[PDB]
């Protein structure tokens, strides 16, 4: 009734009053008070952190949740406004009828094989310090500010520590030198997450220092080998905050996207840098017959608060994705996709609109590779209508960082080699680790070793989805087999707590949940 305008007026005033930071500072003070009461982190971390966020978090709030149109529609109904914050949305596919489903034929004898190294979640802590308390109250330890191990306890290890601690640069430098046996590689995929988890005290200069430093360190050791990286979530500041392109000004993400451009011009062509400076994604031809696609999965992130304003296909990334897939289908080209956050962890509507595009172009896809989870995992795609036929699989390589309680490690994919008629699909992959227990030991030397090989330990005929599909339900029945998977799940450093059946099924359910908030995919695991 007459309350409808009063709503629109009040929200307008508060939004204006939030232009003035002193009130925002008060509003910020409250968020801190909550931070301590909820024990997200020690108070030292709260104050620093909140001060970073309040400015931008309040901006989106004024532009979205507390916008008069949106808010009034919620309290009073459609009569007075419209509430659409995380409303659902759809993507339109082309008018081309999908060709009959078709799987790749296995490679012929003597066919060349390509090696592709996969690096993700390096997470460099430039403040990392040996001897400091690994058990500190702060969300990140083993550094300056962590203090020192109380009561004659062992401090942070020299190369790293099995705890909430990221890596020292020397351990990262060590990784690059020990790729001899893992190589030679034809190209590399790098799905971001370079900074550490010390978000409560990260200036843009701190962020870009890691970008440049780490980028130069890679290009140096790799040399002529092209590296194709993707955007991670820890790479901007504030973390997870990735304003879509329609946002402009100093609060835009231009500083980051343009900084990446300079650092990566040697690796990428012109048309890819064009789109990268805009939305943090790109595509290009790495070799004849293949088309690589790097996605800015921060436009699917629940954490991206900028999506409150408009969560509907930010940057038109999905529509841009379809353009490329259809083009490759016309050419007959295959496709690999890399991104940081895997689709199973995206926003619901985003994830579903993605699932369907996979289903449509199952024949075009030759690979999907992701990270962010820091553990060794995968996710299988099925036909949309029935979720019965597996049609694609994504690989969730484990992180390089120890964060948390992990052995460092990276991933290497053996794929169909560079030759005409290549399917460009994965044939096998290998995982290498660093056994810190032995490296940080007295008189110990860093030694990278192959933890295992895929088809070897799991005895698979191929790396196609069906093989993995069978693999999942197999482990549901056999206990000892999962205990092995559990071991490799943690890069050779599993937890102490045994994984009970509920832990097991939870883990296994995730392997099928390539789509968010859909219990039907875990129907077969428990009746
Ligand atoms: C990384 O290196 C560490 C080195 O400590 C490995 O942990 C060690 O693994 C050995 C055998 O795998 C185990 O030690 C056992 O000790 C018993 C008696 O305590 C002895 O009878 C056995 O012959 C064996 O030596 C134990 O799990 C562990 N040792 C210690 C001192 O912690 C770890 O397995 C390595 N990780 C990888 C992925 O290779
Ligand atoms: C919310 O956003 C979607 C698309 O994201 C952005 O929205 C536009 C405002 C613009 O910034 C685009 O460049 C971005 O992609 C909007 O839906 C799209 O709207 C455009 C028209 O601008 C249209 O061409 C597309 O077909 C639409 N696609 C979809 C999936 O909706 C939507 O209108 C935005 N809502 C508001 C209130 O701005
Ligand atoms: C009545 C509706 C119930 C739910 C409302 C919840 C919103 C709370 C957010 C308040 C943030 C504090 C900012 C105060 C800014 C004051 C500006 C006054 P001025 O423009 O005259 O200077
Ligand atoms: Cl140190
Ligand atoms: Cl079928
Ligand atoms: Zn990470
Ligand atoms: Zn991440």
Residue numbers in the entry: 84 to 610
Describing publication, verbatim:
Acid sphingomyelinase (ASMase, ASM, SMPD1) is an enzyme found in lysosomes and in the extracellular space where it catalyses the conversion of sphingomyelin, a major component of membranes, into ceramide and phosphocholine. ASMase consists of an N-terminal saposin domain and a C-terminal catalytic domain. To gain insight into the molecular mechanism of ASMase function and the interplay between its domains, we determined crystal structures of the full-length protein from mouse that reveal a conformational flexibility of the saposin domain. In one conformation, the saposin domain adopts a globular closed form independent of the catalytic domain, while in the other conformation, it assumes an open V-shaped fold that establishes an extended interface with the catalytic domain.
As observed with other saposins, ASMasesap adopts either a closed or open conformation depending on environmental conditions. By contrast, the open form of ASMasesap assumes a V-shaped conformation with its hydrophobic core exposed and its position shifted on ASMasecat such that one face of helix α3 forms an extensive 1,318 Å2, hydrophobic interface with ASMasecat. The interface presumably stabilizes the open conformation of ASMasesap, allowing it to dock onto membrane surfaces, and possibly deliver lipids to the active site. The location on open ASMasesap responsible for membrane lipid docking under physiological conditions likely includes its hydrophobic surface, which in the crystal is buried by a symmetry-related saposin domain reminiscent of the ‘handshake' clasp observed in saposin B dimers. Indeed, crystallization in the presence of lipids rearranges the saposin dimer and reveals lipid molecules bound within it. In addition, the top edge of helix α2, which is lined with a ridge of positively charged residues, is appropriate for interaction with anionic intra-lysosomal vesicles. In the presence of anionic membranes, open ASMasesap becomes prevalent, docks onto the membrane surface and concomitantly forms an interface with the catalytic domain activating it for sphingomyelin hydrolysis.
